[PDB]
Structures are given as structure tokens and as C-alpha cells.
């Protein structure tokens, strides 16, 4: 599985198409604890990068998450640049506050499918190298801040 | 020809590396090298955290089906099983699972919750004869690894000796032992280190761990014919090599015990 698979895979996809573009058998599981969905693992290891697909009672993908399958270019938030976002501000605003360079995608989701009001994304900001840096996280829904959280920033 | 690798895999980690093989039933030490100093345990503890837990479990404290319902809040660093369940909850063994399987950060949390925390986890461990394995942070910092930072570090001895007992003692239940060490068998992100090297008819139950400053390890219970009759632990710490290459090295010192069993 790797994050060039991720961007293939699309909203609307049944399990199955999910499944094909994923890796099948060799690098996704479902059921057990991950129940209808769909997790996709890079390799084998302790923190291995994955993402995880969930689909509607009608079968069709609302829901695409990842860790690590991406790395920011420039790990480099501040917790200055924390300090100056904040709940209603517009992701244009939230760029402009921290910078994009030190932040990746975590995923993105349609929880009204196939409606589309309400898109969600996550985005996860290292402010340095390494396992688990300190870090900030922002979730934005229809592109508006509504989540904003840090670990340990200076 | 394995104490030879293991030395061979420090130098070319330039890490400190610790190793020992332990005979499960005896409890026999085989070989080791560096058996007593310590290393960050990274995600093997999440091995030990569940076995204080069935202990619960067996004492009627705790219920492997109860549920629980956690949010946004609790979801750390690497949550592929737990940030799906946020709306459901999940059972106690669906937790010890998540943990175990698939090194989920949030589950292992959630347990710690459970029992009362990090030093909930090292007085069970210390009321069971382990004075030296001690959990100190929740995750994700338990990783950090700093050098000479004895918080939540075992010894190579003291954890396969811990693991001995949890697996085959009276310690848990025989229901208890053996969804302890089920858990372990379908560990699914190992692949690359101990299960790599072993031969078809093979048991294996592991369970790896990654942190900070380059640590790795793995502890595991293993052997032929379907049955394990061995522990094996492995850690290392300090090295600047890729993640490969010490990946490489682990491969390695398994593939040299398996030859020489």
C-alpha cells in the first residue's frame, strides 16, 4: 500500500474497488476491530504510515484517513503561530497563521454523503523530525476551523 | 551463529544492543548479552499492560465485554483502530487487540485508564517478583528515549522472565494465558523482524516496538511444530542507521538463532 495508492482511491468507491486500488489481501485488513472498513498498512513495523477507508450502509466511501503517509516538507509550526488561530477563522486565515510547508493531510471525510455538506479535514502539523514530535492538529469542516489542538510546542 | 550477530549488530547500529533467549518451560537462560541493562520498551509493554488487565479480568475486577465510549480528546499519535470507534466505544478486548496487534496508541491509553495508570502497571508488575520493568508517561512519551532516562525501560531479562510468567505460569488463568498469547500470534505489524526468518510449521507470538533516538526491539515467544518453547528478547537503542538497517539487524540475530536452535 503507499500514500500514491491513497490518492487513487475515491469518494463514491464500493469495498471493492477500495480494496483493488489499496492492495488487497497483501496490505489491507477489515473486520475484527476495524469492523466494515478498511485498513491499508506501507510495510510491516511498529507505527507502520496506513490508511483507513469507511464506506455508507449503502457501500459507497465517505471517509478516507491516513498517518504518516505523508511528511511535512518543513516541520516548523511554533506555538506563536498556535496562538494566533482560532475556531471560525477560514483555512485561507489558518494558512496564513501557521505555515502550510510544516503540515500534512490526515484525511479527509464527507459524514452526510452523498450529500457533501460538512467536508471535513485534518491536518497534522510536526514541529520537528522524528517519531512524535511536538505537534499541532486543525480540523476544518467546509473550510472553516472547528478542532484545533497542540502537544508540547515552544 | 547468534552472540556473534548480536555483537555484529552493534557496531554496525553503533547502539547499544541487548539480547536474551530464555527456555519457556524451565526458564533457563540459553544466551544473552547485556541481559541487564535497560532499554525503552516501547510498544512491547503494551504486551505487559494487558496481562495486568485480564489479571483483573480473573479477579472479577474487570470485564473483557465491557464497553467503553471515549472521544476526540483521548486520541494520540497513532490511532489506526481507535479514531474509528468514536462513536460506538470499544470492549476491553477489542482494546487489548488494537494494542496488541496493531501497536494502536489510544487503546493502550484507554487501558492504562483501566487499571489506574503507568504505576498501576509497575506494582502489578513489582507485586509479581519484577522490581526493575517500570511504566512511568502514557503514550506517546513513554517513546522518548532519552539517553540514561530509566522511565519506562526494562532489562532483556527482566522482560522475558516477566513474559514467562505471564504466558505459562499460574500467574492468569489458562483462558487468560491464552488470549494473552493469541493476542500476541496475530500481532499483523512484525513482519519484517523475527516472523521474517522463521521456517513454515513455526509458532510465533511477538510483539515488536519502535521509539525515539533510533530504539526498536521485540519480544516473542516461539519455536517448531506449531508450539513455542523459547523467549526471545531483543533490544537497541541509541543508533543513527535507517530504520531498515536496524530492522536488518533484528532479522538478522533471529535468523542466526533459528539456524542454530
Redesign the interface.
Known amino acids: 500500500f503507499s500514500a500514491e495508492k491513497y490518492e487513487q482511491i475515491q469518494f463514491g468507491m464500493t469495498f471493492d474497488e477500495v480494496w483493488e486500488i489499496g492492495g488487497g489481501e497483501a496490505a489491507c485488513?477489515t473486520g475484527?476491530?476495524?469492523?466494515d472498513?478498511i485498513?491499508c498498512?506501507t510495510?510491516?513495523?511498529?507505527?507502520?504510515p496506513?490508511g483507513?477507508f469507511?464506506f455508507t450502509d449503502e457501500g459507497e466511501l465517505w471517509s478516507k484517513?491516513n498517518?504518516?503517509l505523508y511528511k511535512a516538507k518543513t516541520p516548523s509550526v511554533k506555538l506563536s503561530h498556535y496562538n494566533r488561530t482560532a475556531l471560525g477563522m477560514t483555512e485561507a486565515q489558518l494558512w496564513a497563521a501557521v505555515p502550510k510547508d510544516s503540515c500534512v493531510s490526515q484525511g479527509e471525510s464527507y459524514p452526510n454523503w452523498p450529500a457533501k455538506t460538512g467536508f471535513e479535514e485534518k491536518y497534522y502539523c510536526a514541529a520537528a523530525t522524528?517519531?512524535?514530535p511536538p505537534?499541532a492538529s486543525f480540523h476544518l469542516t467546509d473550510g472553516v476551523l472547528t478542532?484545533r489542538?497542540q502537544r508540547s510546542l515552544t | 551463529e547468534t552472540l556473534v550477530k548480536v555483537k555484529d549488530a552493534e557496531d554496525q547500529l553503533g547502539a547499544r544492543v541487548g539480547y536474551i533467549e530464555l527456555d519457556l518451560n524451565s526458564g533457563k537462560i540459553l544466551e544473552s548479552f547485556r541481559p541487564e541493562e535497560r532499554f525503552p520498551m516501547?510498544?512491547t509493554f503494551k504486551v505487559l499492560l494487558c496481562g495486568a488487565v485480564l489479571s483483573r479480568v480473573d479477579a472479577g475486577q474487570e470485564q473483557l465485554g465491557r464497553r467503553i465510549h471515549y472521544s476526540?480528546?483521548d486520541l494520540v499519535?497513532?490511532?489506526?483502530?481507535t479514531?474509528?470507534?468514536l462513536t460506538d466505544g470499544?470492549t476491553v478486548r477489542?482494546l487489548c487487540?488494537?494494542a496488541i496487534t496493531?501497536?494502536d496508541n489510544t487503546a493502550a491509553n484507554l487501558l492504562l485508564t483501566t487499571i489506574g495508570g503507568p504505576k498501576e502497571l509497575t506494582a502489578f508488575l513489582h507485586n509479581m517478583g519484577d522490581h526493575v520493568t517500570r511504566l512511568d508517561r502514557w503514550e506517546?512519551?513513554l517513546?522518548?528515549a532519552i539517553p540514561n532516562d530509566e522511565r519506562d525501560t526494562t532489562m532483556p531479562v527482566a522482560m522475558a522472565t516477566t513474559l514467562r510468567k505471564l504466558l505459562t505460569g499460574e500467574l492468569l488463568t489458562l483462558a487468560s494465558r491464552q488470549q494473552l498469547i493469541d493476542w500476541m500470534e496475530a500481532d499483523?505489524?512484525?513482519?519484517?523482524?523475527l516472523?521474517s526468518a522463521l521456517p513454515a510449521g513455526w509458532f510465533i507470538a511477538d510483539k515488536?516496538?519502535?521509539?525515539?533516538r533510533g530504539s526498536?526491539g521485540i519480544i516473542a515467544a516461539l519455536g517448531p511444530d506449531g508450539k513455542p518453547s523459547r523467549i526471545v528478547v531483543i533490544y537497541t537503542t541509541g543508533s543513527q542507521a535507517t530504520?531498515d538497517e536496524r530492522?536488518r539487524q533484528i532479522a538478522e540475530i533471529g535468523a542466526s538463532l533459528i539456524k542454530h536452535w
Open positions: 485488513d475484527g476491530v476495524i469492523g472498513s485498513l498498512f510495510e510491516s513495523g511498529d507505527y507502520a496506513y483507513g469507511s484517513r498517518e504518516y522524528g517519531l512524535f505537534s478542532y489542538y | 516501547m510498544s476526540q480528546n499519535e497513532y490511532s489506526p483502530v479514531e474509528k470507534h470499544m477489542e487487540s488494537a496493531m501497536s506517546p512519551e517513546n522518548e499483523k505489524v512484525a513482519g519484517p523482524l516472523r515488536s516496538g519502535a521509539g525515539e526498536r530504520m530492522n
